Enzyme design. Structure first.
Site, PDB file in Angstrom:
ATOM      1  CB  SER A  38      -0.922   0.001   1.216  1.00  0.00           C
ATOM      2  CB  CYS A 122     -12.268   1.409  21.376  1.00  0.00           C
ATOM      3  SG  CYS A 122     -11.644  -0.002  20.315  1.00  0.00           S
ATOM      4  CG  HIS A 258     -11.949   5.796  19.540  1.00  0.00           C
ATOM      5  ND1 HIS A 258     -10.931   5.653  20.459  1.00  0.00           N
ATOM      6  CD2 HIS A 258     -11.779   4.807  18.634  1.00  0.00           C
ATOM      7  CE1 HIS A 258     -10.177   4.622  20.120  1.00  0.00           C
ATOM      8  NE2 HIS A 258     -10.670   4.092  19.016  1.00  0.00           N
ATOM      9  CG  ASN A 289      -8.024   3.100  17.248  1.00  0.00           C
ATOM     10  OD1 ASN A 289      -8.032   3.214  18.476  1.00  0.00           O
ATOM     11  ND2 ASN A 289      -9.054   2.624  16.565  1.00  0.00           N
ATOM     12  CE1 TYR A 319     -15.142   5.374  16.058  1.00  0.00           C
ATOM     13  CE2 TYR A 319     -15.542   7.360  17.358  1.00  0.00           C
ATOM     14  CZ  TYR A 319     -14.945   6.733  16.274  1.00  0.00           C
ATOM     15  OH  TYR A 319     -14.156   7.471  15.415  1.00  0.00           O
ATOM     16  CB  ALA A 321     -13.077  -3.501  20.783  1.00  0.00           C
TER      17      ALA A 321
END
Ligand SMILES: CCCCCCCCCCCC(=O)O
Lengths: 334, 334
Positions: A38, A122, A258, A289, A319, A321
């Site tokens: 990528s 999270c 988040h 993150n 917001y 897992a």
């Protein structure tokens, strides 16, 4: 008739300070792409991520939580002796037991203070904060430490291509205590267990332990599912958190969602009808993150650059897992 | 400026019911003595254990928590629709994420209710109970599920003559909601992180994952250290819990200490100055030490035999891993 007694503490609770710890090592998208297919641009384009920190091998969720707490205590002008309890929220304490909380308290020289580990994926930070406020108001503590800490790097499959550039390590803690004004609004939280797989460890530890030569566990992320979920459902959660706090959208000074993905949060900033000059957290650019530690690290960053000032009215929305979310309106710390 | 508002709920909260799930596979001491040089009499006289239950391979902390909650709801005459949140306390959810809570709520058909996992080792039940009570009084929920669940058997080293006969599996949940009388007393908790090694997983999961052919992790117990700690320190904790609840030792009807070792608890019964006819939980004899599920499983056992009656004044004292303890005086459920 004998009646069990009822206690209570300060009705007004708030964030006295925030202390953040970020691992010394930095990891670039190029460095990442030197083992993945990528671009360092397609990454920072689809996810406002450019770099992130990875912790050393001799570090742990617990050690970083400890350092974060030390900094929060200093930023609040307090010592461990002023803390009644500590809630460590994390998803990467690599021991089924003992909990990290007692160990963190000990490292801070914080006697036999109460404490426990809270895991809500999270959104554990929002749950822990709410819990600390409820405990303080209920009279079970007067001052507490709430630290989100995460060492996710060791759980990343560098060849995932779907998340190897997403997760990162770090820890941030806040001191919660009595304040002249109400600093923590009512907690708004929920979940969607139907989507528990969207963010999961693919192989449970015991199955792996019984098949050592077999595949080892790694964190897997169903990006699109999460992207859609949050983007479309966190707007409603934001309004409920504001409503419960008796505040209107235009009164929000700071927005700290988040740090999952910039594309999701930019969409949320618009759907929440926040005012044009509302400051928005974008700590993800150079932090990635960090799950449970995301929000407190983002708050620290906003303050760090002066983008946010102590006293500012902020909307926090965690917001992630398990497909869990936790939100509240608060007065910025420090 | 704009003052962040608050919310509040029922002041009087209590245990509406208890539901318990015990794995069907009964394991006797003699079965345990096939891998260590000991005997049934030796284990029984020193721990108070004769048999314990081991869960099947297709079961997990989460599946047992689900079943326990179903029973609790039924014993409370409620459905999942009446629940606002669920707190799962455990130390044996073998996935770093997602949390078990969201999955348990989904399995119960409790759509998207709030929930999280709480680990405080063996004393997670006392902490979760207190947290549920603080949340309901705080107005963050009206009725909740608190479930202790544990699948420790897979972490047991069959050769460890120090604890292979100690730990077992099981789960028990209680429904917490508004009651005419105050049913949950103030939480009394703390810890000793200096002794975090006393009950621990010897090797962290990541280190194991990076050396698959090396030794696998197992639970270890420094029995004497724990024995002395609990025996010498829980008495003071019990007195504080009773004091905070405004009750005297002689007023306690039921005593429910963590089922760690019958000898530790017999010593505690005396040291607490409970009246001669006080009913003491001894669920350990056929349940072993189920850590976080221990106390609610013991409450269910006392009620089942009729030894404890709903409304009875009970003293709960959780102690264990991380070296954490949590206690409170409550009114018996169901
Ligand atoms: C006589 C040797 C057997 C070990 C007994 C030690 C008692 C403590 C075990 C319970 C640990 C816990 O709190 O979960």
């Amino acid at each position: 008739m004998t009646e069990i007694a009822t206690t209570s503490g300060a009705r007004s609770v708030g964030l006295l300070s925030v202390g953040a710890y970020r691992p010394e090592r930095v990891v670039t998208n190029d460095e990442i792409c030197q083992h993945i297919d990528s671009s360092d641009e397609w990454i920072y384009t689809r996810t406002g991520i450019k770099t992130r920190r990875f912790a050393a091998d001799d570090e742990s969720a617990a050690s970083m939580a400890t350092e974060a707490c030390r900094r929060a205590l200093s930023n609040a002008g307090l010592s461990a002796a002023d803390i009644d309890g500590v809630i460590v929220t994390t998803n990467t304490h690599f021991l089924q037991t003992p909990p990290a909380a007692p160990m963190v308290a000990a490292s801070l020289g914080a006697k036999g203070i109460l404490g426990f580990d809270l895991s809500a994926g999270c959104a554990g930070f929002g749950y822990a904060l709410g819990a600390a406020a409820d405990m303080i108001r209920g009279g079970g503590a007067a001052t507490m430490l709430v630290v989100g800490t995460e060492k996710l790097s060791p759980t990343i499959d560098m060849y995932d291509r779907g998340n190897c550039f997403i997760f990162a390590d770090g820890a941030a803690a806040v001191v919660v205590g009595e304040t002249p004004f109400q600093g923590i609004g009512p907690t708004v939280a929920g979940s969607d267990g139907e989507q528990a797989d969207a963010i999961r460890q693919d192989i449970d530890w015991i199955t792996f332990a019984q098949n050592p030569s077999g595949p080892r566990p790694f964190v897997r992320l169903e990006g699109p599912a999460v992207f859609r979920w949050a983007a479309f459902k966190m707007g409603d959660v934001g309004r409920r958190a504001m409503d419960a706090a008796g505040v209107r959208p235009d009164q929000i000074d700071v927005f700290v969602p988040h740090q999952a993905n910039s594309r999701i949060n930019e969409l949320l900033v618009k759907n929440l009808q926040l005012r044009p000059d509302a400051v928005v957290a974008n700590d993800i650019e150079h932090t990635g993150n960090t799950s449970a530690a995301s929000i407190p690290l983002a708050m620290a960053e906003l303050l760090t650059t002066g983008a946010a000032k102590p006293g500012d009215l902020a909307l926090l929305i965690g917001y992630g897992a398990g497909l869990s979310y936790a939100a509240q309106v608060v007065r910025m710390p420090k």
